[PDB]
Design a protein around this nucleic acid. Structure first.
Lengths: 211, 134, 102, 127, 82
RNA sequence: UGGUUCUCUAGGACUGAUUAAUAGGGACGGUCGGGGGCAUCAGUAUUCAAUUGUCAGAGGUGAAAUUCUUGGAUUUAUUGAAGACUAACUACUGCGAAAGCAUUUGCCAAGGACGUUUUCAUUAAUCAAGAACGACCAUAAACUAUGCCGACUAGGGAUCGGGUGGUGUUUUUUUAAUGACCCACUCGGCACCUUACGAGAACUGGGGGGAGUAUGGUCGCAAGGCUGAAACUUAAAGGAA
């Protein structure tokens, strides 16, 4: 209700009407009779669902320009237990928010870790980068490895040569940490401990043994 | 653990609207028992329909003593009987489908609870010793 | 018949339940149709608690009456009669009137 | 836990928190005699036994004067000659508080027990 | 500002970084306004009075152990005193 | 209490002790839940295949590449098959002893809280020991965190399940019963925000603080100096400047 007049200014410069319904709790955008940009109603749609997903207004009107788009990463369907899920998601946020703020700085994006999804606004190269960062953070590899390789790739992309050679020797991301292999004799693990559904009886007390 | 039980009144008298006889209640009790209800069912039916509050108050003594003095004694106490038949119902469920590990766990719990009060009833010797749960 | 994806994404809000049903019904012709249904739990006016969830037995009962009355709206229609029935959205009014008791 | 111990625990920590009334349930003859001797020495005010038909409730009113109740969990026998020694080893000071005993003549404090010359098993203390 | 920010994020979905118990949550106005040079990271008077230990009275008895069942006097002590 | 027809109006076969724990167990009742097992149902993705349509690229990357592709790839449309999975709704919510559990419908047993003027009558609490759950195709876990504990007083807001009362709106009617919301009270939960008051003592293997500094000790590793090239002042070639 506070920011809504600014939304009407920022969309009436694109000739898009918008209503804010406060009884059904909705925001609609409509292409009016004076809209010569065919694609701007899509960015108006993204703007109002950004406002619904609780990014603020001066952050969200940077979606009405061509070089910027959204992404909504899905992190809920990756790991099983709630403890490991919230610990990997808090690892995605960081101590004092440092990992998330460094990711926003490197990718030039605006990232919201909310619930069991990750919203992001930015350029498309930054969106590709943050999507791979978030998905590999829900898998087990830590996000500061991706932050390190992002810094390496920025300082590796700002040289005129080495721009058609592969950077895999410069990236420390390739760890080769899969270097265990169990080699027991499989004594019980071949076939032990068949399952029966019926329990055994209990050892009775001395009272039972005497009565 | 929750506190949900019944709150017995401070009075020990018939409630002075209970105009029925102290013997017709006993005749209704032995009639329901001979047609085949457990004593808790006798008590709840007598309370709900023929409004005796509780029969230890309104008759002389409690209704398992009434049934044992009128010849309708149980083979096995009602607690043990209901826990026995719950355990054998879970046992038949387990022989039917054998991937119910939770129902196996509840069978271990029900069998432990069987052994506890079977031990109590045995040292009281309500039921005879050398009683096993088959 | 199909909605656009933006319509049901515009309908789904958190702090309510969506009851969705579907039935496979053969009409008065020998067309057999899988026909779906979505419904979202409202909050009443004067409701001050923010949730308005259904208690999942109300979901089973609502989904039961949804299945029964829309399989009554089919079998009692041909394809042309069913199409002319679902153009002016009136099977939705039948569901609403039959379900406001729950 | 015991039945005298949790009553004395309620009557202890309720007074520590600064309440003017405790409700303690259940209630036995030994609890009545323990509260009897401690109000005889002036540690609690009145108290009332509400008889429900189950076991009884006590509402004690207590002002400020108690600072520890207790029970001595093995009820060992004491002698008239060793009442002074046991008071010395478990009381705070020389004439501070009373050890309460179950005797032949009932529940009494240590100084009444040695006044009328009877020993017994220990029950608990108050100071 | 801190309560409004973390309440707005809590009623949204937004996962916030975790702070300790008496500290101030560091936000964008903390970094821009240079507020921690003037107010510190936490009220250290309350930090001091929470870091102090509870005053545990004066120790009275010696004879036995004091649990919720009362005073256990061991048989060694009963034989020693009697 | 009736098989029918004549206007409710016409016969018919017929022994000899207590409570009943805001202890414990058991029954009952309406329920409650993403608790479990079996069966069933659906969903759209993905992968593959068939059939068209069209033509030269499609993946993928920071760029590339391996790969597929005029024997038509990618894109589009129709349809089939497979194996998974149960999106948004989805919560500081629920259920489970824990690991954990999310499509529909049914069956099978179970469980909890509540309601109870039902029943038994001490049947109970804690845990060492022990038991239950936890020759083919090859896999990741932790990684910045937090807090003062218990035998402990009161609260406050919100929420989940049950119950009682009120008396308004959505509901509605002579087919069965059954809602939703508002308010107060109450029981029991998952949490959160506070308060007052207490000795709270008596898959195994371990040296000794943090930050540094020095070293005529011991153990190591390390310099030289154009290479060829030393017994040979020695070729070609290379290096350096």
């Amino acid at each position: 209700k506070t920011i809504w007049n600014d939304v009407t200014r920022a969309l009436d410069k694109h000739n898009i009407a918008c209503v804010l319904d406060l009884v059904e709790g909705s925001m609609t955008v409509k292409t009016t009779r004076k809209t010569y940009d065919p694609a701007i109603i899509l960015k108006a749609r993204d703007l109002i669902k950004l406002l619904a997903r609780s990014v603020p207004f001066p952050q969200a009107v940077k979606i009405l320009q061509d070089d910027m788009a959204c992404d909504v990463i899905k992190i809920g369907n990756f790991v099983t237990n709630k403890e490991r899920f919230v610990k990997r998601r808090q690892r995605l946020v960081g101590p004092n928010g440092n990992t998330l703020k460094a990711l926003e700085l490197l990718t030039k994006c605006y990232i919201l870790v909310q619930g069991n999804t990750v919203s992001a606004m930015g350029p498309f190269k930054g969106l590709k980068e943050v999507r791979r960062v978030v998905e590999d953070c829900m898998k087990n590899i830590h996000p500061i490895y991706h932050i390190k390789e992002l810094m390496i790739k920025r300082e590796l992309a700002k040289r005129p040569e080495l721009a058609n050679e592969d950077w895999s020797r410069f990236l420390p991301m390739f760890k080769k940490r899969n270097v265990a292999r169990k080699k027991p004799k499989k004594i019980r693990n071949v076939e032990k401990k068949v399952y029966t559904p019926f329990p055994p009886a209990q050892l009775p007390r001395k009272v039972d043994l005497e009565i | 653990k929750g506190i949900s039980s019944s709150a017995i009144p401070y009075s020990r008298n018939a409630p002075a609207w209970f105009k029925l006889s102290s013997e017709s209640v006993i005749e209704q009790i032995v009639k329901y028992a001979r047609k085949g209800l457990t004593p808790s069912q006798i008590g709840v039916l007598l309370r709900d329909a023929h409004g005796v509050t509780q029969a230890r108050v309104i008759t002389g003594n409690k209704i398992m003593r009434i049934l044992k003095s009128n010849g309708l004694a149980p083979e096995i106490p009602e607690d043990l009987y209901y826990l026995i038949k719950k355990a054998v119902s879970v046992r038949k469920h387990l022989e039917r489908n054998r991937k119910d590990k939770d129902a196996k766990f509840r069978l271990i719990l029900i069998e432990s609870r069987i052994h506890r009060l079977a031990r109590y009833y045995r040292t009281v010797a309500v039921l005879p010793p050398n009683w096993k749960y088959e | 018949m199909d909605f656009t994806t933006d319509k049901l994404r515009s309908m789904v809000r958190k702090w309510q339940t969506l009851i969705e049903a579907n039935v496979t019904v053969k009409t008065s012709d020998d067309y057999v149709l899988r026909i779906f249904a979505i419904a979202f739990t409202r909050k009443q006016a004067n409701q001050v608690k923010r949730h308005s969830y259904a208690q999942s037995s109300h979901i089973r009962a609502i989904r039961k009456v949804i299945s029964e009355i829309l399989t009554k709206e089919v079998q009692g229609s041909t394809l042309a009669q069913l199409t002319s029935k679902l153009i002016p959205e009136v099977i939705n009014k039948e569901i609403e009137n039959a379900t406001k008791d729950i | 836990s015991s039945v005298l111990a949790d009553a004395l625990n309620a009557i202890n920590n309720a007074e520590k928190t600064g309440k003017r009334q405790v409700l303690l349930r259940p209630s036995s003859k030994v609890i009545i005699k323990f509260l009897q001797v401690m109000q005889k020495h002036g540690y609690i005010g009145e108290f009332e036994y509400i008889d429900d038909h189950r076991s009884g409730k006590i509402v004690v009113q207590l002002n400020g004067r108690l600072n520890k109740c207790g029970v001595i969990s093995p009820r060992f026998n004491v002698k008239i000659g060793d009442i002074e020694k046991w008071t010395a080893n478990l009381l705070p000071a020389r004439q501070f508080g009373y050890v309460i005993l179950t005797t032949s003549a009932g529940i009494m404090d240590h100084e009444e027990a040695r006044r009328k010359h009877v020993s017994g098993k220990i029950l608990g203390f108050v100071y | 500002r801190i309560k409004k920010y973390e309440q707005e994020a809590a009623e949204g979905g937004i996962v916030l970084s975790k702070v300790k118990k008496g500290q101030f949550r560091k936000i964008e106005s903390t970094y821009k306004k240079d507020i921690e040079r003037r107010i510190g990271g936490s009220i250290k008077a309350r930090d001091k009075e929470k870091a102090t230990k509870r005053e545990r009275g004066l120790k009275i008895s010696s004879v036995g152990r004091s649990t919720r069942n009362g005073l256990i006097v061991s048989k060694r002590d009963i034989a020693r005193i009697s």
